[model samples]
Target: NSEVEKLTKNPANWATWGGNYHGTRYSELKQINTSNVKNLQPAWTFSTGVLRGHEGGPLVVNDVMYIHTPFPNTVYAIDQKTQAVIWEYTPQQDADVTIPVMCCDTVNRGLAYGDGKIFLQQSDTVLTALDAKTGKRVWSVQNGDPKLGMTNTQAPLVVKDKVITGISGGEFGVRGFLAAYNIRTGELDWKGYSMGPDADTLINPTKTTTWKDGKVQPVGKDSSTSTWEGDQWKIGGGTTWGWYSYDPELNLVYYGSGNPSTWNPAQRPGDNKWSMSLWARNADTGEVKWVYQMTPHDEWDYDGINEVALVDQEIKGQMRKTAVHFDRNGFGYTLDRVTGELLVAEKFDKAVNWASHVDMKSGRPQVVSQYSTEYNGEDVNTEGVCPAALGSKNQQPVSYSPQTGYFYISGNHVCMDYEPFEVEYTAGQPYVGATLSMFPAGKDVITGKEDGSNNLGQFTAWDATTGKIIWSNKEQFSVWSGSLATAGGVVFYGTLEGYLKAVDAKTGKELYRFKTPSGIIGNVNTWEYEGKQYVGVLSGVGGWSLSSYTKLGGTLTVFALPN
Candidate 1:
């Protein structure tokens, strides 16, 4: 059977980054369920030897495990039978150049698997495909120009005949894009820029739809350019460095765009169209089907580029195809993926105060005047913003379980004091215009008072249909790792303190916990091998870019219920 057919039939393999094309991050294996998950113990451990921050989890295919690392972007293939490294591919990289260019830790999100090849998106913007069996390079192509402050960090997704990938460096004034390459050859298929003229963005204004006046309508000509004052759209910062999902039935590819160029809101006037928004495009042609902007003209550096999880659920007694996204602006959005209707937008965290709430009619967030960094003027510190720019959530993904009809989310409980100032743009250099200091939420950030609770993050179960939190479990550190939900009635996540934890999926009850070698920033992944279910996570916390943020080490820790 072809790999395509095998992927769906076999629920035991962790083939894709999101575990499936819908980006649900939910597994159907029930071997390690809620009752026995408490008996789970460390089954094995492997050192990555890079001492870098690990962001994504591993992929297990056909009893072989493939794992990736940061910066050098090395990939290793391990045999399940022998627990030995079968092959390792470490690409030649100018670490001095690539490492400094990354706004966050030198994280390579993960990889892509399709057409019998393993896809690796390097931090230096090189996208390479390797023979899965031998780890030999099949073909390599350049995705972006690192010299122009463009880089690759997110994983690639292989949708049918194409392997789609995205770019990073919103902080470098890099013009962002999502490009699809022919799966067989490394040939470019179609490219769509985050914000630009219609042709460059592959947006046919008359056909591309967007939410307007409470209904989905065609985006007028020059939709993106009209929003920008001048030629500023050229260096716009709507980067696409986040997880992507696809709907095979709808033939739609879903993704989101980051913040616009220059964090200082005064510099770029008008709503930065397309940035801080959700997009749905035709999978083969890359034509924009529909788009919905969430936070227009972002002032808190809230990049809208978070993972989009596609789910089909009953909304008001009608079954609807929905795209669920946990945006960096401290809000969870549930939209009609096919038609681009904004159905639900609510703050998953109560501490969020940047916007009172999103206006359903206009499909925009009603930004609070007191929290507006632009209204405060340049160089003025807008203190006590509920969520720091890292967001109530970052690139760490949420897991949706059709079994429980709930999504498990890892979110931050951090606030920030933002000071925006005038800044000049320079190629290949940091173009960020805002200075930030972050602290635990509940505290008076301006007075440096620790009056608020010290908890930095929470793991919560969210109901997208109702936009409500079923339950929330607080943690001392920000829950930076991605979550995993399974048919076992248990959800799994790793903590920054280096513990892999299992909680009851429905009630948020702690069932099991085990400390690993280092702090965990990687997503939790699971697979079944040799008739046993195993859960694995990568730990080696290095991604925090600022001193105000918080780590060094690298490891792959796998667990399973005891025999």
Candidate 2:
């Protein structure tokens, strides 16, 4: 409570991108918890009025909330009290030029507010800062050349004076990296490549290690680009395409990297370094402090792109600053934030046929030989894998409550069959390279013969202290929404069936729930205003999980206790 007070007192508004950078997604308000939470009802509902595929959460600053919509990239500033639009700005996009490269739907996650301007990443690969009061563009700059297949979907992080933004379009053959720009002038300040300096750079500038082949390798350039067949550094996929976190005191930024391209490892040899890794770097200089790769030479498209929750904990009787990341590869990793050493790497769910266990010493999974092509033939087998390729996990939000000391996340209990084949890369075309068929691992099928049913989701409560599963509730559709835990003793999450639920943080008991018009994929947040508390969430269906949208709903919905 004191820590939150010292940062800001006005709870009515959400300030930062991830509801105050700790990535806690927790609010101090308690008027709507496990007890009276059942009495909670909708106080007001405001339709976005315009929607293509909404993925952005509302940003409340100074009694006004800003929202990002898809397509032409609309920014709406709404009255916080009334849920009414105050002003809306739609950026002019080159529809014909950008549509070819956009792999998924034309949607943006959200926007950032800093220095009296809102930073919006349009679908056309431009970052424009708009005045908060008036919906006018202050300045706009291209973060990357769209000609090179680069776009932006993740919201920008405002760290102090720099507006930190990352580029998307990994499937479009774009090399991924993080870039920062001056908030006022929209000028590039610094950029950091995920693959590490270019290939032509010296491999060891200080001559620290002897060259095995007796050849002088460039330190920065010519690094392995693992997107295309061989040495595709031009298309290597270390995309920082999700939410990022930073610690002002440590001066470091922590973000996850995406999967290597081609979906099959036969195309890219050698442990593809840097992709599917968590990088900790100096926020100002963009110099890496340490990196831990979650998946080496990833073949199953397990992107380690979840948010890194910064927290403190005790391990082996030693207290340390730590980062907790729930990976798409079926493991929740706790690492030493300063040194990037693994503190605890445990199986987060019931995973099968992938890796029996993670080799603690090497920090890599001893994956089942059948899962990797190194041992299997060109016809890859994916049966018996417990956690489906979509993962027993996906990029659902996980919240850590200081009050309960538990990390709550949406999990799934599912399985799939994977058949890998050769893929060709052509300019301006969708390039995902694997075909999958899913089935239920434990229960009967909903449709086709009970040859194992597919699509069983669950909400899991994990004891962060011991890294153990406290309890789980199974559902038909996946729990795609991010969760919010509060000191109110309630954990709020949503299911793909469109029910926003509140559960007892201590007991995993369902407290309350309400079906929305759409599925809730965004993280939930709470704030207090004038002695009243309000809960907010963005309810839409898009992203990589769009295949399931027909079963889910789409819209941004907010709730409050009926007066």
Candidate 3:
């Protein structure tokens, strides 16, 4: 375990999803700094051959790079020197069955490396650990059932001795949960449901706390059930399909749960308890330490399952451990990781109109009646809601730069017209319960003038410590790619137009860019090979995009200075 900790800490290896356990996505390498980034060029490329959408990037250990593909979940071990595939592992899965059950496009986020094994979460609900050196199966276990409409598209996170992963089925009426398995033996460590009775959710009725009335308090008996209507909590859609972050010092694992089952807010009233919330749970026992709901009663299908960035910052003149989350509802939240106390909630996007602002005392968004789908009634379309269901920022993650003390993020500049309708939940069938149409933001709202420029995406540098946006750059399309920051005073992200771009971290100025084979939805990653710091990313048109010209192809393009 210490070996992995050392591996992740080194700037030479990108050993985890966020490049580190804290999920900072920050590399300490400075060899490719802003001074020479304009000289950055594609040094090599590898094709996956088969691709629908490539969401995650590759993992590099020592000098070997590990690559993963979509659907069947094929992994390749390539030698960095020769650019040759040493070994590849592809699993047999029923694509017909798994593909239909997937909430979105068939995409595998990436892999995790620890205990001398590579962890893969397949689309068909199997969590596999392959021998890192030989590409052989060390241990495999089923995390969810595709039969009941539960699948996986998230990358696994290896915490101390356990590999933590979440489920995906928010639109299929699947009860969501997060499970951990032993890294060495693949045995079940603990399972924690997103919502249910205390025993099922691993929430201690007397111990698990939440932010309420300007303070943190213990959630009383039947905390989750009391908020739901009847047994609707059984099919409650609090899927944990997004990226998760862990703080080793606190022994707390942080993740957010997706939207509630029926998108129609009238169907299941009352706050929906744990649904659309940020949770901090004990890594060892899966015990709930604290939870905070962002969207109480769902309206516009804003899922709460986004990445939670853990950072230590000075808040109100006091240094505190904080969790920063950019929610689908278009609100940036900052909370005390230890006590679940609400600190700061601000809008990252200026066009955000769903809520006026978040009330610090009650920790709730002030819903605007004009944009509330529930208030507009079922079958009545709520027009001009900023941040379409895809959210201000979706699964594409944000990166933190310790060098500049700013977080870089990719986000949507789109809004939606949402219409909720009555629908019944069927096993293994879609349970969306709503219809949505998306367009560029500021077209219907704000100045009431048409958005002539068609800016659908925006990347930003944020200060989580004070909840402020330092700078931002607008994009032609929604930026679905994850961001990577480094000590080189540069930030890297990909565009939907297949361009890998590097920008100034503090000023948000574009510094360098290179067009790839396809649109980019994968995270940009960095690692060093033979004393040379290299940057790499996967480009394959995927993760909800269209209209703009983008060819489809899976290619890993690695870049470095002219060697």
The prediction achieving the highest TM-score against the true structure is 3
Q: Can you rank all candidates by TM-score, best first? A: 3, 1, 2
Rank the models by lDDT, top first.
3, 1, 2
The number of the candidate with the highest lDDT is 3
**Model 1 stretches astray by more than 4 angstroms:** 443-451, 545-551
At residue 3, what lDDT does model 2 achieve? 33
Better of 2 and 3 by TM-score: 3
Question: In candidate 3, how many Å is residue 559 off?
Answer: 0.2
Candidate lDDT (C-alpha), each: 0.88, 0.70, 0.89
Worst 10 residues of 2 by lDDT: 208-217
Cα lDDT tens digits, model 1, 297-380, are 889889999999999999999999899999888889999988988899988887888999999889888989889999998999
The residue-by-residue lDDT of candidate 3 on 473-522, one tens digit each, is 87889899999999999999999889999999888888999889899999
Candidate 1 worst ten-residue window by lDDT? 443-452
Instruction: Give candidate 3 regions above 4 Å deviation.
Output: 443-452, 545-548
Q: What lDDT score is found at residue 398 in candidate 1? A: 95
Using all chains and alpha carbons, the TM-scores for the candidates as numbered come to 0.97, 0.89, 0.98
